[PDB]
Amino acid sequence: RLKPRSIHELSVEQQLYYKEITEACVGSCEAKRAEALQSIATDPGLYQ
């Protein structure tokens, strides 16, 4: 008996989004930061 291969609770848009927002929030470019900061400030689905 092998338990089923589980899936991460984030979608692959959510990991890509998370990866883009975190790589923008380390501030290589300032306009990228500022949008990523506004995206953090008003994304409704940023829970989970």
Binding site: I7, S11, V12, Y17, A34
Partner: protein
């Protein structure tokens, strides 16, 4: 609250107008109920030349009222219109400022720019675009599988070597031990040789069959 400010921006402008008209050759420090009375008669007066001069022009098949429609509207309210050029040229005449605008910034939003997805052919292009993936897109995801024969051979080999080393060190430490060097028990411990009664049995006999 911008909901009641739709009405209170123009009714509290009419309160400054009555407060400016009761000061011109007149009062200071009026009663409170006497100001909301007079600014209610002022709003009801502008709303009555609105409804009646529109009615007098639309009776004459027109849509916007001329001067001849208001000088008949004010006659039907008993105004004596001829005294109005003398009232307009007062030296006490004052101007009350118009109310402020709620949207002072006008355009203060950086916004959030996200585009994904197109339109099915029953939705034309002028409807808003479909939103991003996080809004409604879910795919399961799994852990990275290591199907490599090299690292699987290495893992099985090292685990077998480590478990047999642990087993032989445990059995040499909890029994009689021999050593090639002097008092050498920590490094290279040998399980001591124990003779049997029937050595051929332990020997020839297969153990996995």
């Amino acid at each position: 609250n911008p909901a009641d400010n739709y009405h209170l921006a123009r009714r509290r402008t009419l309160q400054v107008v009555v407060s400016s008209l009761l000061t011109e050759a007149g009062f200071e420090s009026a009663e409170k109920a006497s100001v909301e009375t007079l600014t209610e008669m002022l709003q009801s007066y502008i709303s009555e030349i609105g409804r009646s001069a529109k009615s007098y022009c639309e009776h004459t098949a027109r849509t916007q009222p001329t001067l001849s429609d208001i000088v008949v509207t004010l006659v039907e309210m008993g105004f004596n219109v001829d005294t109005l050029p003398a009232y307009a040229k007062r030296s006490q005449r004052m101007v009350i400022t118009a109310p402020p605008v709620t949207n002072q910034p006008v355009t203060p939003k950086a916004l959030t720019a996200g585009q994904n997805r197109p339109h099915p052919p029953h939705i034309p292009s002028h409807f808003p675009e479909f939103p991003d993936p996080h809004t409604y897109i879910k795919t399961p995801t799994y852990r990275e599988p290591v199907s490599d024969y090299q690292v699987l051979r290495e893992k099985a080999a090292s685990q077998r070597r480590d478990v047999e080393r642990a087993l032989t060190r445990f059995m040499a430490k909890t029994g009689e031990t021999q050593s090639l060097f002097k008092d050498d028990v920590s490094t290279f411990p040998l399980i001591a040789a124990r003779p049997f009664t029937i050595p051929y049995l332990t020997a020839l006999l297969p153990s996995e069959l």
